């Protein structure tokens, strides 16, 4: 076929036409940091963390949605790219509340891991952080909206995968909150995956709330039995008891979604 030839950090890559920069780098084993974009959902480009310089780039191009053309070299470790990561990330850690000891994502938070890798060691914020009032979308999914990063990951899941269009954003500016504008029951039978979708502690499992921490839990691979699809899952076992049902990774069985009953 076409199979346009591209480069990443100098190394040549054989990639298919129409692919994005992030997928092209993923071929060699490059996981560009990302918050808004997910594999199984449509590209949004709101995180702006994926911003990575390419060869001879007057302007940095977002790796989330950037069809890479012929003869393109991705400057993964360029100083401009690293400056891009630091700039947008500190912007993420501007109104985020000091809840790491409290938020259940601590130790398994995507945001936390990026900060040690692609982040500065100190802050410059000297003003008052924003605070978002909490909502309630189910007695199974804790809603703490002050930790939201407005990555619209939950928005796409409700519309595309879940199929119920009730979740979304509201307002504008810094007060661009994510919610429903009205007390609503998030009724999707596979809505439990919204906990895994959210990279932060904005959505937290109410039954699992304040129960365990990532490093002590022992992961064991298994398959659910409540349904006959056999959606394989992972059980989090700490000190000989089960607390959390982690959906597994199997393309032709369950992708990465499981029902709330299974979860």
């Amino acid at each position: 076929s076409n199979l346009i030839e591209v480069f990443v950090d100098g190394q040549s890559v054989m990639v298919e036409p129409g692919t994005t920069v992030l997928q092209a780098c993923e071929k060699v084993g490059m996981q560009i940091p990302r918050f808004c974009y997910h594999e199984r959902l449509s590209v949004a480009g709101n995180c702006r963390m994926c911003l990575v310089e390419i060869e001879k780039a007057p302007k940095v191009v977002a790796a989330c949605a950037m069809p890479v053309m012929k003869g393109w070299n991705i400057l993964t470790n360029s100083e401009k790219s690293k400056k891009a990561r630091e700039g947008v990330m500190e912007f993420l850690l501007a109104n985020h509340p000091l809840d790491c000891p409290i938020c259940d994502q601590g130790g398994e938070c995507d945001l936390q891991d990026q900060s040690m890798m692609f982040g500065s060691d100190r802050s410059r914020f000297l003003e008052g952080k924003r605070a978002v009032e909490d909502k309630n979308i189910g007695p199974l999914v804790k809603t703490i909206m002050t930790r939201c990063i407005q990555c619209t990951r939950c928005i796409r899941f409700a519309s595309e995968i879940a199929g119920v269009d009730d979740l979304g954003t509201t307002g504008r500016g810094n007060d661009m909150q994510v919610g429903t504008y009205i007390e609503k029951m998030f009724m999707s039978e596979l809505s439990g995956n919204i906990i895994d979708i959210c990279p932060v502690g904005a959505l937290t499992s109410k039954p699992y709330a304040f129960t365990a921490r990532p490093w002590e839990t022992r992961k064991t691979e298994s398959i659910d039995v409540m349904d006959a699809v056999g959606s394989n899952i992972v059980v989090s076992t700490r000190t000989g008891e089960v607390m959390r049902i982690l959906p597994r990774m199997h393309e032709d069985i369950n992708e990465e979604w499981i029902s709330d009953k299974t979860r």
């Binding site: 071929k27 060699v28 084993g29 996981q31 940091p33 993964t76 470790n77 130790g107 891991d113 990026q114 040690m116 890798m117 990532p214 490093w215 002590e216 022992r218 992961k219 700490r238 000190t239």
Partner: protein, 209 residues
């Protein structure tokens, strides 16, 4: 370094050790495989197992090397390799105040010629290594357990050996002397899989495979 956080470098030493790295390579092309000096000025010689006693002899004897001090004996075990145990020596040259590292590879069954003749310090370091890892060396004077318990079976430092061990002991009055039994902990070792799921160093990343 105008920045006071990162550690400085000694490029003069780094090249100088690299020059001696290739120096040994021509001297003993049969035994060395590849010689590498790390970024933090540590030049390591990688030699073949069967030629363990000559290279150590050469470094102890040669004027330009004069490495006569067996600093340490280590045999770091990596389960993913065919011959797991890689035996690492450690030498110091007093006259050139520099350190060299010569190392081989050896499975659980292959015996190595003991380097006690070339280094008397290897003697007790030899009694420890066979204890912890289980790699027997040949024609050692008195190769025998000097670390583990008298009759303690199994080399504890092996990867397959659990940290908690296999047996535990306890005094028993019905026999009026201590006695062993299978290990049964009051509290198990709670494993902490804390490794970050995000890449930490782009420089050391392996090529795609």
């Amino acid at each position: 370094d105008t920045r006071p956080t990162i550690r400085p470098r000694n490029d003069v030493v780094h090249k100088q050790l690299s020059a001696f790295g290739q120096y040994v390579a021509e001297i003993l092309p049969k035994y060395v495989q590849q010689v590498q000096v790390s970024c933090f000025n540590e030049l390591e010689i990688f030699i073949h197992p069967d030629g363990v006693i000559p290279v150590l002899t050469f470094l102890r004897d040669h004027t330009n090397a004069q490495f006569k001090s067996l600093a340490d004996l280590t045999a770091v075990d990596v389960p993913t390799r065919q011959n797991r145990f890689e035996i690492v020596y450690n030498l110091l040259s007093l006259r050139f105040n520099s350190r060299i590292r010569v190392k081989t590879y050896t499975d659980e069954l292959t015996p190595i010629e003991s380097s006690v003749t070339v280094y008397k310090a290897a003697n007790w370091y030899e009694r420890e290594i066979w204890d912890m890892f289980g790699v027997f060396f040949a024609n050692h004077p008195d190769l025998r357990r000097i670390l583990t318990d008298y009759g303690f079976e199994g080399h504890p430092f092996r990867k397959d050996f659990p940290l908690s061990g296999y047996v535990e002991l306890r005094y028993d009055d019905e026999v009026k002397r201590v006695v062993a039994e299978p290990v049964e902990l009051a509290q198990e070792f709670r494993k902490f899989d804390l490794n970050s799921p995000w890449e930490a160093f782009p420089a050391y990343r392996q090529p795609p495979e």
